[PDB]
């Protein structure tokens, strides 16, 4: 039916209108104070007033930190940009890691622009170029102008073109009898397809046949666009989208990450501010999530202390599972959660507590009904006892081998014997480690 | 074809109740691991869940990769099976996370439904209109069958495919409209005046009868990585073969995920997940493990199968020793299959099957002595001795391997243990760890 | 005979559903309660608008990248459309840097140093280094000894464009590799040859996996021309920038000449073919669909984007095959217009609310659109299904044959609790 992967039984924080966390709501069991703190953080992000606010989710393994991150993402909605990231992703062989971090920082910022578009469209009726006086003169083109006649519903318009537009028109491979669509903002032409006013069944080029477009040939339409600031920076650093030669050859070169300068980002900020001041654009700040932040070294942390102090920085959520560990890139500095103390002073730490037997049992209950499986009560008690004895995750994954072993005996219900058979067939970390210690040749 | 290490394994050897036979499909013994692998096989065949980590652990020469090829052979066609080693991730143009992302996306198959039209008949007239420089091409094709006749219109790709493998007004061609393929089936007109610049001896086929144009539904499976590489830049289809896919941006991947879900919503496509098999998984850095721990939690995640032959040893990138060479976070979200050593009857059955695969006839006493030396030494040595003993017996001009042939093969070619023994009495002849060697014999 | 039909939400419908859920800041319980009771009515109006069809909340339009441009726009027997796209970012440069660093004048030595470095002290000059040129011509096989001076002082793209495969003499040190020998044989070779098929892996992989009928999945978000550099008070800067941005040789190379202009140049003017400017050097796209970043709205996505409309499209085929007369009920008129244009796309015989006896007398009309005596109806359909019995009872009252009602419902929304 549908596919599930270690999540998707979580639909939100499950708070009230007063911010009080109910015990079993939103797919969440327990973690009440952490859910309330994350709800206050969600309201702070919705307030749209602060920049560079950082929190850290600190706890042990299998305690609900990534679940809280996706819960915050689902509470904020699809409008707010959310950028998930693992700490190993910053090490690029193309560009330095500082630029990758700043690229993600700009990617966690949204922008909603209402843009107007000038559109010429219709079915091509005539296509007649006029020649130049001296074609082999070295300077100048072979043609001077091209006359294109477009017709539509209640309209017929005759267009005189420069050579630069007609190069794009012929790059789209138009013909007489074609419905085209010309963008006046960038000179782009889209060839929609053949018109249905002629015969259809006499082609061999798998084409699609469109009716005559409605309205006048010349139009002005309003389009709502959703971009990020990284898109503006990338589109300006490697220019495409013009009909000039440098943008024309920028599409053919192999793309590569470059070090975007501060001057380009300042100019992009100036253009976005001028858009906002005219009542056209709207700024939607978002969240950057860095899971496994202990994989960062001291240089990325030291750049984080400078990148957090900008006046455009997003809200960055960090996660760790470290006790009193040495920071990577150092030899003697030992810090809580693997994060240096110059950054910890700028964070707000949120604790995340372990579970009890009843919480483990009901987590197995929701994971069973989301995976579309039916479990007996005694098998559920045995699974909860395994989850306390070995791990919650091991009891969570053993559900689907139990379902396969139940289906292979022409049955639907999961019984205790299936759980014992899945105990025997599949092992956990502790049993495998005990086999490893008592072994002949490094098993 | 040629004979490889696992050429004798075609399947997993299981019943309808997922119970292993003692000898089936080239696999002997290892009952519990084969039953667990059959459970993983049914888990893949259901296609319901995503991102499960399976670890296969045991001593060397036990049947780890044998189990992996059994799963791959029982998986069937059109389901992806990506097999990588631990050392292929380290690249000079790709980061480790990018290489692992591409290895994850190679294991998810997208099966696309496509409506095509087929045209077969006799060519009556070809008119081709070209420009003076030869760039713009257009024309008409006049094709006929017994009952029908239709003048078509051609474009540049059709004239390019018509000029290649030249058709000459009386040949019978078959046109695929969606794949754009022109296939010449033969010639039926038998034209009298042939200006023979060529040595064509084309087949005499009949003129086809019936409908000229016929619809057909086709299916083809493509991978998620291939769609990403095609959509990344202008010439990405070349980069599917040259490997010039340098760090595909994340925006391409989000748009491809949304479009694949959209194609599922119209019934045009469907998602067929597969198995990614990472052999020698201890040869991965700690950053790769930290990436895998969160890459297993995505909607588009395959079933990851890992094989390890190592004990409590040092994790790469760190300074501590962990079980199986893997950190405890990765071991938390994995289910472990344990594989055990062999008896002597299993070794004998393995050697008999490997002799039958190489088409080499063995005597009884040769089989017992090969079994004894595969018990005392390793099994792979006694499997390697079979072809050498066959060539020795073929030197004497008889097609059966005796005890003398395998005895000569044991004398000529050495084991590991005899090599350690011979090196340790003659340490002066070989170069030591400190660079000292005596080369003079006196 | 009451039949209820359930359909799951689509991806876009779930997207605006989650947007509407996150907009009002987690008060869904009161929303559902006072939606079931029937300000908040304007809040739930958007919810039923999304649940009906996603085009009521936001109409789908042409999908194109954002144009980061300032161009010549209109503020409203032919018309002129001239290319005028620019970049909003301006880089301002003083005149002094240009006139004293890039342009030659009497007080600077740009052209003197250029001549000294590029002509006089060039080591491929045959006027001073004839022996090196003769050595290189024995090495390479070039028939001219001035080829190396020409190659070393021209740009790379110009060298790609005017490169001609001229003949070279045999008595030289240059060779033919076996890879090049394999390449040259299969240039025009037909199918079913062994060498030709062993050298054509990529085209066979293209034609086997049906790659000329695949759809484009990614388009860029922002498209932006190069950054415009302005210098106030200088025509030379404008001419230099226009020459660099619109170089006629490379612009002709990435395009082609029209066929009638080639006929006029070859025949009416006597220009030989070898004297034509080199054209047609742009790479071919993968498909027709991969040639541009603009995607038009299609009338196949319009059906699938609404689960109710998709289920009704599947349900209408069986009633068309069984030849009934179907009544469709609504609550608004925007959905009435949307279903009217959908039916005209499908070309079904339908009438829209002197029409009553026209409906009874003519059996050719299939779908009647009504808004909350028609005895000729056989099947009545509730699109916007509401369980008020006062409206439902009279709707079944205005409807000898078997009468079946249909209700289109969406799983996991307000209507499922309704």
């Amino acid at each position: 039916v549908t596919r599930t992967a270690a999540h998707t039984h979580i639909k939100g924080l499950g708070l009230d209108e007063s911010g009080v966390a109910k015990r079993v709501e939103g797919g969440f069991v327990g973690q009440i104070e952490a859910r309330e703190a994350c709800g206050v953080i969600v309201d702070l992000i919705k307030a749209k007033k602060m920049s560079g606010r950082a929190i850290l989710l600190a706890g042990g393994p299998s305690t609900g930190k990534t679940a809280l991150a996706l819960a915050i993402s689902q509470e904020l909605g699809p409008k707010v940009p959310f950028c998930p990231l693992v700490g190993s992703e910053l090490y690029s062989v193309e560009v330095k890691k500082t630029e990758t971090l700043m690229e993600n920082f700009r990617r966690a910022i949204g922008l909603r622009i209402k843009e107007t578009k000038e559109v010429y469209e219709g079915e091509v009726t005539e296509l007649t170029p006029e020649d130049a006086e001296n074609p082999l003169g070295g300077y100048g083109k072979t043609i001077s102008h091209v006359i294109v006649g477009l017709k539509s519903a209640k309209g017929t318009k005759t267009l005189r073109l420069d050579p630069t537009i007609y190069e794009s028109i012929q790059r789209e491979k138009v013909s007489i009898g074609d419905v085209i669509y010309i963008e006046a903002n960038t000179g782009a032409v889209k060839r929609v397809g053949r018109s249905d006013a002629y015969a259809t069944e006499f082609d061999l080029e798998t084409e699609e046949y469109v009716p005559l477009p409605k309205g006048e040939v010349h139009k002005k339409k309003e389009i709502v666009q959703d971009v990020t600031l990284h898109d503006l920076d990338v589109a300006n650093a490697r220019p495409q989208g013009g009909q000039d030669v440098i943008s024309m050859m920028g599409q053919l070169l192999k793309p590569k990450k470059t070090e975007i300068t501060e001057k380009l980002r300042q100019e992009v900020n100036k253009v976005v501010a001028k858009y906002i001041d005219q009542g056209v654009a709207e700024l939607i700040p978002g969240v950057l999530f860095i899971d496994e932040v202990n994989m960062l070294d001291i240089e990325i942390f030291t750049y984080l202390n400078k990148a957090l102090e900008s006046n455009i920085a997003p809200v960055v959520v960090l996660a760790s599972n470290r006790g009193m560990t040495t920071v990577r890139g150092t030899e003697d500095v030992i810090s809580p959660h693997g994060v240096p103390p110059d950054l910890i002073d700028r964070l707000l730490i949120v604790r995340t507590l372990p579970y009890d037997k009843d919480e483990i049992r009901t987590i197995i209950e929701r994971r069973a009904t989301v995976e579309r499986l039916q479990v007996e009560s005694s098998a559920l008690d045995l699974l909860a006892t395994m989850g306390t004895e070995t791990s919650l995750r091991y009891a969570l994954q053993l559900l689907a081998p139990c379902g396969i072993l139940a289906q292979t005996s022409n049955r639907k219900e999961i019984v205790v014997n299936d759980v014992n058979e899945a105990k025997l067939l599949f092992l956990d970390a502790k049993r495998s480690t005990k086999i490893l210690e008592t072994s002949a040749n490094y098993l | 074809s040629l004979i490889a290490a696992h050429s004798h394994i075609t399947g997993l050897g299981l019943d309808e109740n997922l119970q292993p036979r003692p000898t089936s499909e080239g696999m002997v013994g290892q009952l519990q691991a084969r039953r667990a692998a059959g459970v993983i096989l049914k888990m893949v065949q259901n296609g319901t869940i995503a991102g499960r980590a399976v670890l296969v652990a045991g001593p060397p020469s036990t049947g780890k990769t044998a189990l992996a090829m059994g799963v791959s052979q029982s998986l069937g066609k059109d389901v992806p099976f990506t097999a990588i080693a631990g050392s292929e991730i380290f690249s000079l143009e790709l980061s480790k996370t990018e290489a692992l992302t591409q290895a994850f996306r190679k294991s998810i198959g997208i099966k696309i439904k496509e409506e095509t039209e087929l045209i077969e008949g006799e060519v009556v007239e070809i008119q081709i209109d070209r420009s003076i420089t030869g760039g713009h091409k257009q024309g008409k094709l006049t094709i006929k069958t017994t009952d029908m006749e239709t003048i078509y219109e051609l474009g540049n790709k059709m004239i390019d495919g018509l000029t290649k493998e030249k058709v000459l007004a009386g040949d019978v061609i078959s046109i695929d409209k969606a794949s754009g393929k022109i296939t010449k089936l033969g010639r039926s007109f038998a034209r009298s005046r042939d200006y023979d610049a060529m040595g064509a001896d084309t087949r005499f086929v009949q003129c086809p009868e019936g409908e000229l144009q016929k619809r057909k539904t086709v299916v083809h499976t493509v991978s998620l990585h291939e769609i990403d590489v095609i959509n990344s830049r202008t010439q990405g289809f070349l980069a599917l073969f040259t490997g010039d896919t340098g760090e595909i941006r994340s925006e391409v991947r989000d748009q491809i995920n949304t479009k694949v879900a959209e194609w599922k919503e119209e019934g045009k496509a469907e998602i067929v997940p597969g198995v990614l098999f990472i052999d020698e998984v201890h040869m991965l850095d700690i950053e790769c493990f930290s990436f895998i721990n969160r890459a297993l939690e995505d909607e588009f995640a395959p079933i990851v199968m890992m094989a390890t032959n190592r004990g409590v040893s040092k994790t790469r990138g760190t300074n501590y020793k962990s079980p199986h060479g893997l950190p405890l976070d990765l071991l938390d979200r994995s289910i472990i299959i344990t594989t055990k050593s062999y008896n002597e009857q299993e070794i004998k059955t393995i050697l008999s099957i490997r002799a039958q695969e190489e088409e080499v006839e063995l005597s009884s006493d040769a089989l017992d002595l090969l079994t004894k030396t595969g018990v005392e030494t390793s099994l792979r040595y006694s499997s390697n001795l079979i072809s050498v003993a066959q060539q020795i017996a073929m030197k004497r001009k008889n097609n059966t391997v005796e005890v003398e042939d395998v005895k000569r093969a044991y004398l000529l070619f050495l084991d590991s243990a005899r090599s350690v023994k011979y090196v340790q009495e003659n340490e002066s002849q070989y170069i030591d760890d400190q660079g000292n060697v005596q080369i003079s014999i006196a | 005979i009451e039949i209820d039909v359930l359909c799951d939400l689509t991806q876009r419908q779930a997207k605006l559903y989650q947007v509407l859920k996150s907009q009002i800041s987690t008060n869904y319980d009161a929303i559902e309660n006072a939606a079931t009771n029937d300000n908040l009515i304007n809040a739930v109006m958007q919810f039923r608008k999304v649940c009906n069809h996603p085009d009521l909340f936001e109409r789908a339009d042409v999908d194109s990248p954002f144009s980061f441009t300032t161009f010549g726009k209109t503020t409203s027997k032919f018309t002129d459309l001239i290319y005028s796209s620019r970049n909003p970012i301006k880089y301002s440069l003083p005149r002094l840097i240009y006139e004293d660093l890039i342009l030659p004048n009497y007080n600077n030595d740009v052209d003197i140093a250029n001549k000294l470095k590029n002509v006089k002290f060039n080591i491929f000059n045959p006027s001073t280094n004839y022996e090196l040129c003769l050595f290189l011509s024995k090495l390479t096989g070039e028939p001219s000894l001035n080829e190396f001076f020409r190659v070393s002082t021209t740009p790379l793209l110009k060298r790609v464009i005017e490169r001609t495969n001229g003949p070279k003499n045999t008595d030289s040190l240059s060779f033919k590799t076996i890879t090049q020998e394999l390449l040259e044989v299969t240039r025009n070779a037909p199918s079913e040859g062994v060498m030709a098929s062993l050298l054509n892996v990529e085209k066979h992989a293209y034609e086997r996996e049906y790659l000329n009928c695949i759809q484009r999945g990614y388009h860029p978000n922002v498209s932006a021309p190069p950054v415009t550099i302005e210098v106030l008070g200088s025509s030379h800067v404008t001419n230099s920038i226009n020459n660099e941005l619109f170089d006629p040789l490379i612009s002709q190379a990435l395009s082609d000449i029209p066929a009638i202009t080639q006929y006029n140049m070859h025949v009416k003017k006597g220009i030989p073919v070898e004297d034509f400017p080199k054209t047609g050097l742009f790479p071919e796209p993968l498909n027709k669909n991969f040639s541009s970043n603009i995607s038009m709205p299609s009338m196949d996505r319009f059906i699938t984007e609404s689960a109710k409309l998709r289920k009704l499209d599947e349900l209408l085929v069986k009633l068309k095959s069984e030849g009934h007369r179907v009544l469709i009920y609504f609550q608004m008129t925007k959905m009435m217009d949307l279903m009217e244009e959908y039916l005209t796309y499908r070309q079904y015989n339908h009438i829209r609310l002197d029409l009553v006896h026209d409906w009874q007398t003519n059996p050719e009309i299939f779908v009647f659109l009504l808004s909350t005596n028609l005895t000729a109806a056989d099947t009545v359909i509730f699109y916007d299904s509401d369980w008020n019995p006062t409206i439902d009872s009279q709707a079944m009252d205005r409807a000898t044959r078997q009468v079946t009602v249909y209700r289109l419902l969406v799983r996991g929304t307000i209507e499922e609790r309704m």
Binding site: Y198, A199 | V124, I128, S131, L168 | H266
Partner: peptide, 28 residues
């Protein structure tokens, strides 16, 4: 009724004709 076929325009272009008995090649 039957829709008209699309107009065909080949002006200033060479032609290659291939028939049963004879092949032509019209050049400029």
């Amino acid at each position: 009724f039957v829709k008209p076929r699309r107009p065909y325009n080949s002006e200033g272009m060479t032609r290659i004709l291939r028939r049963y008995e004879e092949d032509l090649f019209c050049t400029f």
